[PDB]
Symmetry: C2
Subunit: 366 residues, 2 copies
């Protein structure tokens, strides 16, 4: 099973294929298994590498998830699959957001140099027989090259680093991830906090204003003063213009804030995984310090000792390999969502301004 690690300017990294490939997930189908009124939803996965489509119910993705988690979980963070919700198994909204989350989940895997070209993931996609599948699902479940053993399939195209060099790279990752986790948890709180404020009390204000104005115009109109008519219209419109800004405001987070939040959630997810991934490397590095203590107590041999080293190094490269894939994608992701949030923001203010500028051009120069 080929899992190579090469070095570079940025340091170790996986070998990214030259012939990249993604995958689409849509067309919420409906399929069946004698139970009466209990038909599970089925999605369609259309790879790009070969155009040959396939179907999969949510339960199969969960299955896929556990496999990937069990197989590489000790080295590669595995994207979280969405929760198992409010018993709303059948309408527009539900399938939509779920299919949205599955789409993003699939693309993550497809983009991963190591996962995307594994047997389990691959066979998960390209399969014809309704039984050619059962065979794979079976082969998958008996693959003992999982857990820590996955490192046994990795081949570093570089020298050894002592136990020392290993422990150090471990600490580093552990300090970055904890830091970024703490950092994203805030960005998430203020955002959720700002969100809650733009969809609630803020609109009501512009709503109270716009109404306050309109009632006043109504009062002037009862004045019964010769020589007026033009103003009460300008006023009344200003109010209605404000009411629309109330709507525009209360309906904006769904166009920008939302994406910024989602991106952060996805990442809070990757981060939540390091607590585990880091405890295993720590134990591994700690177990390699006893090498000397062991060799002297005549428990193992120098060859056994030297293996423990060349072996725990592979671990680092894999956790070096994984981070390098992380950072790579982190930098791309935040640069796109922020770029997106701002753009939407801009248009937002620009739009409001134009709305005011209109009600304005209704009041004479005097």
């Amino acid at each position: 099973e080929k899992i190579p690690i090469i070095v570079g300017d940025y340091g170790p990294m996986w070998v990214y294929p030259t012939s990249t490939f993604d995958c689409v997930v849509a067309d919420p189908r409906k399929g069946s298994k004698m139970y009466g009124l209990k038909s599970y939803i089925e999605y369609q996965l259309t790879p790009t590498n070969t155009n040959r489509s396939v179907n999969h119910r949510y339960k199969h993705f969960d299955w896929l998830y556990e496999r990937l988690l069990v197989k590489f979980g000790s080295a590669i963070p595995i994207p979280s699959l969405p929760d198992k919700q409010v018993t709303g198994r059948f309408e527009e909204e539900f399938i939509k957001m779920r299919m949205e989350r599955l789409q993003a989940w699939m693309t993550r895997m497809c983009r991963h140099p190591v996962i995307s070209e594994s047997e389990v993931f691959q066979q998960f996609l390209n399969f014809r027989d309704e039984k050619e599948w059962k065979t794979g699902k079976r082969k998958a479940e008996r693959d003992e090259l999982a857990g820590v053993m996955i490192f046994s399939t990795m081949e570093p195209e570089a020298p050894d680093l002592d136990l020392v060099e290993i422990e150090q790279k471990c600490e580093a990752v552990g300090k970055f991830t904890k830091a970024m986790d703490d950092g994203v948890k805030e960005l998430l709180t203020v955002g959720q906090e700002h969100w809650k404020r733009c969809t609630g009390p803020l609109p009501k204000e512009y709503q109270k204003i716009g109404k306050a104005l309109q009632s006043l115009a109504t009062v002037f109109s009862s004045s019964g003063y010769q020589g007026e008519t033009d103003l009460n219209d300008a006023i009344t419109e200003a109010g209605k213009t404000y009411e629309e800004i109330a709507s525009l405001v209360a309906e904006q987070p769904k166009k920008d804030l939302h994406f910024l939040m989602e991106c952060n959630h996805e990442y809070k997810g990757f981060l939540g995984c390091f607590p585990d991934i880091i405890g295993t490397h720590k134990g591994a590095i700690e177990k390699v310090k006893e090498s000397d203590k062991l060799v002297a107590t005549s428990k193992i041999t120098l060859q056994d000792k030297q293996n423990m080293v060349k072996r725990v190094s592979i671990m680092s490269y894999a956790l070096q390999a994984e981070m390098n894939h992380f950072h790579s994608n982190r930098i791309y992701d935040y640069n796109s969502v922020i770029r997106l949030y701002l753009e939407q923001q801009v248009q937002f203010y620009e739009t409001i301004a134009e709305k005011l500028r209109q009600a304005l051009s209704r009041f004479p120069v005097m």
Copy 2:
């Protein structure tokens, strides 16, 4: 003393001069009257009609106020002079807002067809000797043509109106003013409410955001990942950009909301003069209903009766005359402040947008 009332399409109205004139008030001077460390502030009133300047301490305006109130108070609402404040007699802020309120107060009087061309108001302005003034202040205080008597100087260039027609115009004014008063009191509340929200909790938010972002960039920068540098700068700047929006926001009401509020206060003031002002007329109209009852009880004569009528009509024309001056100016005033508030609003949103659009363009492109 000429105080004529003519009729028109809109009905009775004062005779507005053809050669209009305003007056400026600025340059907070400092005068002295041997008390030691007790020098009262003095303002400078520069009429436009003749360019000859004059000085006046606040105490003199109060004096002017009482005179105008005593003289025409039974027919013309007299703008309120600002309160007598927090014992902060000497700095930037205080004199500024006070001088602002005096300026607007003077312009109100200058714009009034009846007040502007009265002896007391006029002499208040154009006077040379430090004694030529004492003479006027003296002449003013002995003018018995005040209170109800002011109507004796009014000349209606129109026929007589009957008690019925009178009571009706009275009710009307009473219903409009009460209505508009109630209406402006709200516009004032939401505004004060919106104000308090833009100078407090709202900025703190954009402040928390901008900081949340900046801490996060700080965390990424500790990552120690080969292949990044450009993003943490874009992020950190976005935060600082938000902090500036916090300032911009918390500092906006002073540029628009403020004028809109002030205009409403001034008017809440005219309205508060309600009452008094339409229950001398109310009493007058009520006293004219007893005309018949009297003439029959042989208390007065038909000639006496017919006088009461032609006489209470003059009152209406003078009042009616007052409203027509009110509405006239009301329509101009609201059309200018609203026009002003919007314009400022527009620029506000336009500015914020431009600020975002900048942090946006810090975007790479990768």
